[PDB]
Each structure stands twice: as structure tokens, then as C-alpha cells.
Write a protein that binds this ligand. Structure first.
Ligand SMILES: O=C(O)Cc1cc(I)c(Oc2ccc(O)c(I)c2)c(I)c1
Length: 248
């Protein structure tokens, strides 16, 4: 593998890697709430709502349960994820949930209206998402989305990104650190090959793309912190049970 790099050939996916790519892709596609048809489908959250504004908060938490479960359904469709013990599966899910959800919203960013679209249906602006409880985390996700425009990602690259986030062998508490590292590596390798095959005409695409992983981990972490700030303001009543399970 390093030899071909040396000779300057950019390896495309092996047949086994194509199988894994099809699986992850299909997993994302089956749980990503598009469309190909999001955006003739989105209703714009009224300009006055979210002008912590609890009214805005209520709209987000109304659809958050489905958004979260869609992330769990994704992981469920990856066999490697199934080989892991219940404790790990849960620790992995709680670790990547917001990284994956914020990626999913970021890739639905629209320059025209300057809106992200949540859960495939609700288009919000930067201010509305900030004020509905995300604060600077909203800025982070909008800046990310603006930035991902020119990466021209496809369903496959978004799915691989998700699986790479999911298989983070460094979440606290994990039993199978080694096995989870191996899965991720296998995802990163398929991913990179897939990118060589895709021949994006951006220089240093792969490293640039990996920096996005780091940003999403930051978004996750900063969200954990926003979550505390919310528990103190908004009344625990307003938080859906699954929302609480995942982040507390
Ligand atoms: O679009 C999807 O499937 C995923 C998705 C769903 C939602 I609701 C969302 O907004 C959030 C997220 C966390 C949070 O604490 C609050 I308040 C609002 C984002 I960003 C992404």
C-alpha cells in the first residue's frame, strides 16, 4: 500500500472495500431523512421564532428524538458495530451522536437562504439555532456547512465520515479499544480509496477532509457544555427522555 503511494499511484477501493462502502452507504441512505428531495420539502421556521428562547428550543426538541434515533438506526446497520458489546455500543453512540447529527445538518446547508435543514424538514437560520439553545455551537455548525459546500460530498463520503466518527476508540469507558481502532482504520482506508476513485479537483482533499473530523469532535464537546448550560435554564420537563439519555 505504501509502495503505490511511493510510486505516486492513488489506490481505489478493493472489492472487499467496495462491499463495505456499499454497506455503510446504504446504512446512511436508509436513515438520512432526505430526499434526494430535501429542499422542495423543507418548511422555513418563521422569522419571529428564536428572534435561551424557549419557543425555538421547543421546536428543536420536538424533532430531536427522531434525529437521534436515526443515528442509532445507522449504527445498527453496520455489522462491525454489532460485533461490539452493549456497553461499548452505548458508549460509542453517546460519543458520536452530536458529531453525526451536526454533520447531517451541515451537509444540508443552503447558501441561498443561509439555512441548515434539520431532520430533513425544518430550515433554520444561524440566529434561530443559536438562540434555541446552541449558542456558539450554532456558529460552528454553520461555518462547517459553508465550508463543506466546496467539498461536494456524496452520500458515500458522508456515510464513511459518520462511520469514522462512530468508531472512535478513545471514548472513555470502552472495553474493545483495539477492535474499535481496527474497524475505524478499515473505514478510513476504504474512505481514502473511495476519495482517490472520486477524483475531486481540490488539492489535499483527504487531509482537508480529516480536519473536518476534528471540527466535528469539537462541536460534539462544545455541545456537551451547551447541554449543561441548558439544564440550568430550560426546565428538565422540556427535554425529551431520549435527549436526556444520550447527553446526561
Ligand atoms: O438533522 C438531523 O437529522 C440531526 C439534527 C437534529 C437537530 I433537532 C439539530 O439541532 C439541535 C441539535 C442538538 C441540540 O441540543 C439542539 I437545542 C438542536 C441538529 I444541529 C442536527
Amino acid at each position: 500500500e505504501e509502495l503505490q503511494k511511493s510510486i505516486g499511484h492513488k489506490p481505489e477501493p478493493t472489492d472487499e472495500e467496495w462491499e463495505l462502502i456499499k454497506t455503510v452507504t446504504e446504512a446512511h441512505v436508509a436513515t438520512n431523512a432526505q430526499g434526494s428531495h430535501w429542499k422542495q420539502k423543507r418548511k422555513f421556521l418563521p422569522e419571529d421564532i428564536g428572534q435561551v428562547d424557549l419557543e425555538a428550543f421547543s421546536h428543536f426538541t420536538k424533532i430531536i428524538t427522531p434525529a437521534i434515533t436515526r443515528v442509532v438506526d445507522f449504527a445498527k446497520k453496520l455489522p462491525m458495530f454489532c460485533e461490539l458489546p452493549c456497553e461499548d455500543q452505548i458508549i460509542l453512540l453517546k460519543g458520536c451522536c452530536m458529531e453525526i447529527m451536526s454533520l447531517r445538518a451541515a451537509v444540508r446547508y443552503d447558501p441561498e437562504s443561509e439555512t441548515l435543514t434539520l431532520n430533513g424538514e425544518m430550515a433554520v437560520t444561524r440566529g434561530q439555532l443559536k438562540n434555541g439553545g446552541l449558542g456558539v455551537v450554532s456558529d460552528a455548525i454553520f461555518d462547517l456547512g459553508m465550508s463543506l459546500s466546496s467539498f461536494n460530498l456524496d452520500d458515500t463520503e458522508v456515510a464513511l465520515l459518520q462511520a469514522v466518527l462512530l468508531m472512535s476508540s478513545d471514548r472513555p469507558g470502552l472495553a474493545c479499544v483495539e477492535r474499535i481502532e481496527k474497524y475505524q482504520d478499515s473505514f478510513l482506508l476504504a474512505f481514502e480509496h473511495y476519495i482517490n476513485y472520486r477524483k475531486h479537483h481540490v488539492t489535499h482533499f483527504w487531509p482537508k477532509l480529516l480536519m473536518k473530523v476534528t471540527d466535528l469532535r469539537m462541536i460534539g464537546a462544545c455541545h456537551a457544555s451547551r447541554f449543561l448550560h441548558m439544564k440550568v435554564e430550560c426546565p428538565t420537563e422540556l427535554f425529551p427522555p431520549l435527549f436526556l439519555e444520550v447527553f446526561e
